[model samples]
Target: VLSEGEWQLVLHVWAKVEADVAGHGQDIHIRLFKSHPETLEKHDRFKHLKTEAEMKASEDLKKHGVTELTALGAILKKKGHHEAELKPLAQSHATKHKIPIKYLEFESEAIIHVLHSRHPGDFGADAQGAMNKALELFRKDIAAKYKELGYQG
Candidate 1:
């Protein structure tokens, strides 16, 4: 539920994300891990990783961060309308990842954090507000997908 102007604003901010995909991913992960360090306990790529500074420099985190940004880029480009895209990811996370919805919430926050922190001049309250609405829908959609996929968590 974004207005045309809001769409433009969100995309304008996202230009930075498209430009430095992996860095944006890294920022998101750092933010997420900072807020939710418990997720690292079971993270195959990151479980072995300890300390905030250590995680910051890990290429593995950067690679996974790329995946995060890629998925978010696709969702943002689709305007959160790509149910087809959401379906498989929902299954992957729900079935295989078995992560909690809270992780998605943290991820959503981390994404907004990256957009705002990295592009302060371009991303202001307007863009942040717009993205909040967009990502909220994404959060709901993913949860709906999980329910539909019989994701117990």
Candidate 2:
């Protein structure tokens, strides 16, 4: 069974798919939110160690987006619930906020790198298939939970 958090991710994926077919050009950009001290600690995947430029960029990006877990979850839920309205707003917001927006890049490439690092053994040859499996598993779990909770009536 998927956790509640996982179910939220599933719905968020649906929102992404909706935007794709609708030609809205929106995508989920999950910036790792580590505090200054936390980033200094070991195992900071988001901490840039390659160049002073990258490090400086990371520093500047520290507060650009939402960090709180609950706030992030709420935002994702809102996106899924209002995909038609929300996708355009998100695309426009990226331009308004001066951030570049790309479709399916991070979700496919960067996410695969993270997953492979997290579970090297199950690093599937097909990242898209892996992502689809995750969505399917979470969807079933969410449906089961909702039915059990009497939300299906």
Candidate 3:
């Protein structure tokens, strides 16, 4: 769903964020929580974080956010070449975390929000659309694999 130009946009922006995984990743997860606080209820480790500041302050949240975002950055770099790489994470979220597909979709938007927030100058409508499309492809693969794992959720 993403063009080469779109891929360039996605990669270039992600490269800037990847420079400080700890900071940007935490911002992403915190944004996710702010946008969809209910997602925190899906994770035992994060459910206790009632507010953005609390979520931001949690060391566990920061660590997990960095780890998750790092994985996503890797898959984004791989473009459409990493379904096998994404399968395990899909299965884990589906079974171990019991995370709903909607929350996963919300994360796609959350990432876009973070990108736009980080570089308002670059993320115009077309760039935002490209990012949304990229995230949709990423989410589709993971959700498909989640179903493949016999998860009805």
Candidate 4:
């Protein structure tokens, strides 16, 4: 869904945060929980997290965050060629966790906040748009898996 220029923009931005994937990923989750604390209830491990700091402090959250960032980092390495890399994660979220797709969307949205916070000047309109498109593609593929699993949520 992203053009060549957009792909480059994503890759360029990815390079900036590649070194701190775990931190940025955890920040995304922290922002998500801060914006919508109820989302934590959906995760068995995260449900006990009553605050954003608590969520970030949990090893489960850190592991999951790094795992997600690593997956995204892999996709960034090829500049969108490995979009399918997300399918298994989507499938697990849909079939096993039964996490609603909305929260995934929210997570993507929270990621935008993290990007802006890290690269306020670099994350311009084009970069923001590119990231949004990439996230939408992720959501679309994940939603397809969710549907394939007959997940009504």
* CA RMSD of each candidate after superposition: 1.6, 14.9, 1.6, 2.0
Model 1, 1-153: lDDT tens digits are 778887777777777788999888877777787788876654777876677678768888888888867877787788767798888889888999888788888888888877878888888888889988888888888898899888554
User: How far is 62's C-alpha from truth in model 3 (Å)?
Assistant: 0.7
User: What is the TM-score ranking, best to worst?
Assistant: 1, 3, 4, 2
Q: Write the per-residue lDDT of candidate 4 for residues 33-141, one digit (tens) a residue.
A: 7788777677667777777678768888888888888887776566555547766776788877778878888888898899999998989999999888877776777
- Residue range with the least summed lDDT across 10 consecutive positions in model 1: 39-48
What TM-scores do the predictions have? Answer: 0.91, 0.32, 0.90, 0.87
Inter-residue clash pairs, candidate 1: none
* Candidate 2 stretches greater than 4 Å from native: 1-58, 65-94, 97-108, 121-153
Candidate 1 C-alpha RMSD relative to the actual structure: 1.6
lDDT of each: 0.80, 0.36, 0.81, 0.80
lDDT of 2 by residue, 3-70 (tens): 45554544544344333321111111222212123323322454454443454355333332223222
lDDT of residue 104 for candidate 4:
82
Best-matching candidate per TM-score: 1
- Residue 5 local lDDT, model 3: 91
Q: Best candidate per lDDT, number?
A: 3
lDDT of 3 at 91: 74
2 against 3, candidate with superior lDDT? 3
